[PDB]
Amino acid sequence: TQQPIVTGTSVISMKYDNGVIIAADNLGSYGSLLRFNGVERLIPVGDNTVVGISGDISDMQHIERLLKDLVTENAYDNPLADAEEALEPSYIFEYLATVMYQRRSKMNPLWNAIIVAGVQSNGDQFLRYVNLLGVTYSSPTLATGFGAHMANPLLRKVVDRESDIPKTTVQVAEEAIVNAMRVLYYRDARSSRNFSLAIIDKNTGLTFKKNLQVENMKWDFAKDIKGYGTQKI
Amino acid sequence: GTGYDLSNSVFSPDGRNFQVEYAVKAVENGTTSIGIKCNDGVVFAVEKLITSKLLVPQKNVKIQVVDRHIGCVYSGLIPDGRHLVNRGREEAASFKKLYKTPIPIPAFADRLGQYVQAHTLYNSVRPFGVSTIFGGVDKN
Ligand SMILES: *[C@@H]1[C@H]2C3=C(C)C(=O)C(O)=C2[C@@H]2O[C@H](CC[C@H](C)/C=C(\C)C[C@@H](C)C[C@H](C)[C@]1(O)O3)[C@H](C)[C@H](O)[C@H]2C
């Protein structure tokens, strides 16, 4: 029984025709103090999986070290570690989910919302969420914290039910994701301009873009706003 | 009277632990395995006897990885070797957990060294029936 100290805000994600995209900004907040500026919250595991993490950063770092250990351990006495016996996103997910639920059951949670994105060995897209309660769910789009409220509505405009997945391209998914980071930066006081984004594609592999920026920011109209009601200049 | 050899941690009158000496015999009886240090790394190799056509080729791997940067190979009782390696794996995980850096090979050598020594201290255990060649690359 605890309380988050250094925190990461939304992680957002969606699936498209051939894979998944997942994004998260680079801020570690300390309450209202925008304390840390180069925080990576996308964790690549293998070449087929990205784990996006919000909530407590100390706990993030702990999950991070668990994930390194999975890779080490799976490698052991395993001639097929880089082939048929690599880690699948589904395995990494069931592992985290088990851990998260056990830690809520001991009244000592890992204080996070997590999204596992990747592609299964048969090509299938994988997108599933787990949080500090051990609650899990899948949807064509998935977002944590603030993202659930603002990103989902926009991502759901693009992919709205399963049948939209085959119709949606990387260009279009990436556009939608980038757009949502922009909107979240506009209205989430715990968000940053800087973000990482990752595409995991059944043909093109894992693409990991660091140091992205929220683009094309409309602020001009702000000059025509004076007072709070009756003021003229 | 004698019988100094029936029991693991007993000094013979010339100061020897016969049980250890007999464990060496099981090693000597094993497949040959080797290691060569080169000038930026190490190479491990081992002889695997084909008892019969029935053994799937390439499949019964003898060499084992510890952490990400350590190889061990051994001759003697194979299960003993695995047990040594399971311990090595715990031992490197713990070190990495606490100190963040991967275990230096000298550090790692002593961890196996202490554990194997431990198995010459009591008569409730038997010594390891292996010799282990092992190593890898570290910060220096
Ligand atoms: C514009 C979207 C939007 C949201 C959150 C929404 O609810 C909504 O109704 C609109 C409408 O989008 C239309 C095009 C839909 C198409 C699937 C999306 C495209 C071409 C690109 C996305 C990045 C657009 C977002 C989902 C959007 O920014 O959020 C028209 C452009 C309509 O004019 C508009 C009202």
Q: Inter-chain contact A76–B93, Cβ cutoff 8 Å?
A: no
Distance in Å from the first CA to the final CA of chain A = 53
Partners of A48 in beta bridges: none
Partners of B5 in beta bridges: none
B102 close to B69: Cβ distance less than 8 angstroms: yes
| Residue in A65, A72, A79 closest to B68 by CB | A72
d(CA B51, CA A78): 23
C-alpha separations of A81 from A47, A76, A87, A123 in Å: 12, 8, 8, 18
C-alpha separations of B115 from B27, B62, B98, B125 in Å: 18, 21, 19, 12
CATH of A1-233, one of 1.10.1740.10, 3.60.20.10, 3.40.309.10, 3.40.50.300: 3.60.20.10
The one-character DSSP state at B119 is T
**Is B97's Cβ below 8 Å from some Cβ in A?**
yes
Whether A176 is in the pocket of ligand 1, judged by its Cβ within 6 Å, is yes
A217 close to A183: Cβ distance less than 8 angstroms: no
Q: Which residues of chain A make contact with B59, given a CB cutoff of 8 A? A: 79
Q: How far is the CA of A119 from the centre of ligand 1 (A)?
A: 27
**Residue A117 amino acid letter:** A
Q: Inter-chain contact A75–B61, Cβ cutoff 8 Å?
A: no
Element housing A205 (H / E): strand A205-213
Helices and strands counted in chain A (H then E): 4, 13
**Residue A38 amino acid letter:** G
**Method of elucidation:** X-ray
| Residue in A69, A72, A79 closest to B61 by CB | A79
Tell me chain A's radius of gyration from C-alpha atoms: 19
3-state secondary structure of A30: strand
d(CA B31, CA B10): 29
Q: How far, in whole angstroms, is CA A149 from its chain's centroid?
A: 14
Q: How far, in whole angstroms, is CA A175 from its chain's centroid?
A: 16
d(CA B19, CA B23): 6
- Residue A129 makes CB contacts below 8 A (sequence gap 6+) with A113, A114, A115, A116, A136, A137, A138, A142, A144
Structure tokens at B56: 């799937």
**Is B37's Cβ below 8 Å from some Cβ in A?**
no
Domain boundaries, chain A: 1-233
Closest-CA residue to B66 (of B42, B50, B47): B42
Q: Inter-chain contact B89–A79, Cβ cutoff 8 Å?
A: no
Whether A73 is in the pocket of ligand 1, judged by its Cβ within 6 Å, is no
**Is B67's Cβ below 8 Å from some Cβ in A?**
yes
A29 close to A20: Cβ distance less than 8 angstroms: no
- Residue A119 makes CB contacts below 8 A (sequence gap 6+) with A19, A20, A48, A89, A125, A126, A200, A201, A202
In A96-116, which positions are buried (b, 16+ CB within 10 angstroms) versus exposed (e)?
A: bbebbbebbeeeebbbbbbbb
d(CA A137, CA A131): 10
A99 close to A106: Cβ distance less than 8 angstroms: no
A45 close to A67: Cβ distance less than 8 angstroms: yes
3-state secondary structure of A132: coil
d(CA B80, CA B86): 10
Return the percent helix, strand and coil in chain A, to nearest 5.
Answer: 30, 30, 35
The residue assigned the tokens 């606490």 is B98
d(CA A72, CA A39): 24
